[PDB]
């Protein structure tokens, strides 16, 4: 059952929202401002929660990768990203640390290739669940080798720019349909972890 | 001009960013009113350790130049055309801003010229040059953190008023602004409430006789 | 097909991007003040105002057609580099480039 | 970034004599034009410290320190003040035959009010 | 029919002040802090409005009309006026240009002069076309000269304080009743414009 | 009393301050920088962290105690030195580190 | 009649604490931190006021008062320390004058003798009007004489170090017995008067 709701009473805290979403399970986010601005389907990922998603993600863990910690860490980062841009917007953008960089730039691929969407299913608007684990592992994996690459001694711009071709083709992910693959993972994802491994000691030096 | 039903929503968010901004301003104005001391105190001692250095070689050059006879200062000073102590600019980001610094270089393209030996007073020539590229490089080292002092200092008003302005123009408007909406908002929700409570007791009092 | 192209529906997401991108800017530009804002938000904030008074001044008896209000859109977002322009497609972007 | 090496002094001649020989400024030899000003103690102007200073703190911008002595830069208090600019930064060092004094810096002033 | 209106609710937003504002086609609003200056009305361009001034401008511009050009100027300058007051306000005055500062100078003297109507004898209650395009000419004439001497080389603080009595004159040519010059035109406002054109030669010398 | 020791109620104190002043040290280290935060900041930050990762997350078939969650507070507090404890006893911070 | 206003419907503009404050004369706050402090109550200047005080001060004056005269001077060294903190935090810690430093030093020993008490012994609790008129008087004629006895040349440290247990008595008046002149008044501060008074000689050389 998938129900969309909106305000009839003239404010955002009515009794159909707040009776939907005490008797519903899922919360699921919808911006018209920011599906306005080429960001459709938009969802809020501060404010959300699912019971499901432990016993779907029990079935997963043993029949697919730890798509969980991979969810964990991508609400994490877009939690971070939300308060990194008031700092970043009130304080200055040069006026924060390299860590952040890597935290906004894991956030802006993931809000890019996650949120980003042309179309009904035009342009390859079909995703699937191990496509979708598959593409943020390569993002959570780039986000970690930056970040540990950044740990060790190395520049900002010299790891930024010492990706390349790695955030062009983890952001241009969304492109590609799941032909490339067998039926349901991308065999490009899979070159593309062990590419972004080689790929991590180049930008680290 | 304003709404009139469910406008505190903007306001909580608009006075909580603004207390973030304010908490993020009184921290970065607190670590540039310390760093603005901290470098004061060390400008405050090396501009006298710099004036008495600067002194004593200045004593000491004046009195070579004076025993020497014909002094050739003007004529050192058009005879040199490269420096040995440079300086080298750099950014450091300390408090959020970025502060220049120097890096002291040491040239070794020219260390004796034409007017260090020329008989007996070369020797008190070439001595005391020796003393004053000592109290020259010290005096530059020390002389160093004037530009940062000089920014900080200039940075520091401003982010303090910057401070003092949003959090003191930030809470009362948005506040006043909610209070008056929600007591609108509370006598708009009773009166559609009166209205339908006294006609429901004029549609019960018919069914409450038979 | 044949009465208007497929880069309109990108295009006025861009130039909705852009615009509440110099709006959300120029708001924040009076608090804190022109030192703490970035290349970005001056880009957005000279677009809100080239295409504040370009596109929303016209006349009331002439019409303007749909080609030439895409056209002049494109003008108005084509200040900023073509690697900062997400929302449209590289295809479609790439050739009305 | 690399943009200023040389090391400007306004002072008199024994102490620019003594650090033209340990060596802070020099000439540049792209123009004939000397990166320093030999003032003499009562026999220059005080019109040609401000054409001096003027000329190296904004006409000029490869110096890194611009020096000023106490003297010098006392009757040059109005334009040494009114420069509160970091690029060049200005350095308030005591004069020859006067002693130090903590009202003879524009950096003091400012640096006392907002601390 | 000019009926005025006043907030029963404490605020705009009412049905009795919207309501009449509404069916209505001009509008005058008042300032509450020009109305706190002691000026009656205050208001340019944010709580004023009228559809009949391009046709009621035909003939007032027909019989020897600069209003069209100096009321759209005057219009703008008081709408910038509250936007660089609002900007001077909360930053401070570093962040603003000379231009802004020759533009609040104008709009102060404009805003001072043009919103006191209150009157202190016989001679300051009306207020003819001629006068107000004169004075608005001046006025114009005076904020055009302060930002070309500025641009040929000249200081904000040098160019009011230069000009002095010369807008002090402008501004307190309203005490008296128009019965000199030719028939409401008198030749302190005419000799304005030569006085002015004077300093301004004068000043950027 | 019984079941739960008399430092329980001292160590909410320097936890909450810990946890309190990381919470400000997160935001000020990204405010400052990396050549401006301070070492109790830094501290707190990495106490944040910390205690925030082995306190308050857990799984759903454990169990905890008064004596589990003591001796946890007292691990998560043992990263700071004794110089930089100053919001319980000393008989309680010198006999539990 | 001492009744409490607690806030009722997570608003603070409501008729019950609004009219209850405007109908009453006298207010008595209290604060979070105050209470966590040991005060009580938790308002030292800014947070109790009373119109009343002239009455009372007219009838505890007709009694054997003495603390109608230094009733201004007790609230005016708080307020001149609460005001010194804004200026020694803002403007800087080597702003302040040696006055300053005397007087926040008084009002702390004031305010921690006097509005410091948690019921640590038996005199703490009951408390005579002649032992809280002479601590006043001692405070002011210890204020009186540290301020003359510096302004004749000398330090802070050493105008502290010179008064000694002169200044620390008085904080330690508070633990001893109320019996101490006739039964309520305090023995202490008639001898320390004379104690503070020759000791003012000592701390100037």
């Given at each position: ?77 877009l ?9 970043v ?25 996650f ?20 593409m ?13 690459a ?50 991590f000691?180049?930008?680290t030096? | ?6 406008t ?20 970065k ?18 501009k006298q350790?710099?004036?008495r ?20 200062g003007?004529?050192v ?14 950014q ?26 020329l ?5 008190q ?13 010290t ?13 900080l ?7 303090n ?6 959090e ?20 708009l929700?009773r ?20 | ?23 959300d ?12 804002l ?20 016209q ?33 479609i972007?790439?050739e009305?480039? | ?9 306004i ?13 802070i ?10 990166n ?13 410290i ?11 911008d490869?110096?890194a320190?611009?020096?000023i002595?106490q ?25 020859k035959?006067?002693?130090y ?15």
């Amino acid at each position: 059952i998938v129900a969309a709701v909106s305000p009839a009473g003239g404010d955002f805290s009515d009794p159909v929202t707040t009776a939907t979403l005490g008797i519903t399970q899922v919360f699921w986010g919808l911006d018209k401002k920011l599906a306005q601005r080429k960001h459709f389907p938009s969802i809020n990922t501060s404010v959300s929660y699912s019971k499901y998603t432990n016993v779907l993600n029990k079935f997963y863990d043993s029949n697919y990768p730890e798509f969980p910690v991979l969810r964990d860490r991508m609400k994490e980062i877009l939690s971070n990203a939300e308060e990194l841009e008031q700092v970043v917007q009130l304080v200055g953008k040069s006026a924060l640390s390299d860590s952040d960089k890597i935290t906004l730039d894991v956030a802006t691929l993931i809000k890019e290739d996650f949120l980003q969407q042309n179309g009904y299913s035009t342009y390859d608007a079909f995703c699937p669940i191990w496509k979708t684990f598959d593409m943020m592992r390569a993002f959570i994996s780039y986000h970690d080798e930056a970040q540990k690459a950044v740990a060790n001694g190395a520049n900002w711009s010299k790891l930024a720019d010492s990706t390349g071709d790695v955030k062009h083709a983890v952001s241009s992910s969304k492109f590609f349909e799941p032909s490339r693959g067998e039926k349901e993972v991308h065999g490009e994802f899979e070159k593309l972890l062990s590419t972004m491994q080689e790929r991590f000691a180049e930008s680290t030096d | 001009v304003f709404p009139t039903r469910m406008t505190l929503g903007l306001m909580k968010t608009k006075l909580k960013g603004a207390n973030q901004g304010y908490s993020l301003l009184k921290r970065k104005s607190e670590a540039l009113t310390k760093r603005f001391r901290d470098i004061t105190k060390r400008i405050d001692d090396a501009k006298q350790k710099m004036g008495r250095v600067m002194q004593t070689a200045a004593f000491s050059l004046a009195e070579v130049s004076y025993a020497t006879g014909e002094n050739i200062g003007y004529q050192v000073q058009e005879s040199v055309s490269t420096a040995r102590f440079k300086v080298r600019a750099r950014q450091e980001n300390v408090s959020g801003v970025y502060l220049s610094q120097f890096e002291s270089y040491i040239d070794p393209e020219i260390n004796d010229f034409r007017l260090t030996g020329l008989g007996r007073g070369g020797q008190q020539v070439q001595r005391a040059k020796e003393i004053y590229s000592r109290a020259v490089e010290t005096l530059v080292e020390l002389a160093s953190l004037q530009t940062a002092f000089i920014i900080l200092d200039e940075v520091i008003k401003v982010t303090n008023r910057r401070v003092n302005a949003i959090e003191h123009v930030i809470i009362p408007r948005t506040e006043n602004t909610i209070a008056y909406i929600n007591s609108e908002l509370d006598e708009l929700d009773r009166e559609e409430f009166y209205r339908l409570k006294k006609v429901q007791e004029k549609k019960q009092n018919e069914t409450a006789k038979l | 097909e044949g009465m208007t192209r497929k880069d309109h529906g990108d295009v006025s997401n861009q130039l909705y991007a852009k615009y509440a991108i110099g709006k959300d800017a120029a708001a924040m530009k009076a608090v804190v003040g022109e030192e703490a804002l970035s290349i970005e938000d001056k880009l957005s904030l000279e677009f809100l105002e080239k295409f504040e008074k370009t596109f929303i001044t016209q006349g009331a008896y002439e019409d303007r057609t749909v080609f030439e209000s895409l056209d002049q859109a494109w003008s108005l977002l084509r200040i900023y580099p073509k690697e900062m322009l997400n929302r449209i497609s590289p295809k479609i972007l790439d050739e009305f480039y | 970034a690399e943009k200023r090496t040389l090391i400007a002094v306004i002072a008199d001649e024994d102490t620019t004599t003594g650090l033209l020989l340990a060596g802070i400024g020099q000439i540049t030899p792209e123009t004939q034009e000397k990166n320093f000003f030999v003032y003499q103690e009562g026999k220059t102007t005080k019109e040609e410290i401000t054409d001096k200073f003027n000329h190296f703190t904004e006409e000029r911008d490869d110096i890194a320190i611009l020096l000023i002595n106490q003297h010098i830069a006392e009757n040059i208090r109005a334009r040494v003040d009114s420069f509160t600019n970091a690029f060049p930064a200005i350095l308030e060092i005591p004069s020859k035959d006067h002693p130090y004094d903590p009202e003879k810096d524009s950096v003091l002033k400012r640096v006392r009010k907002l601390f």
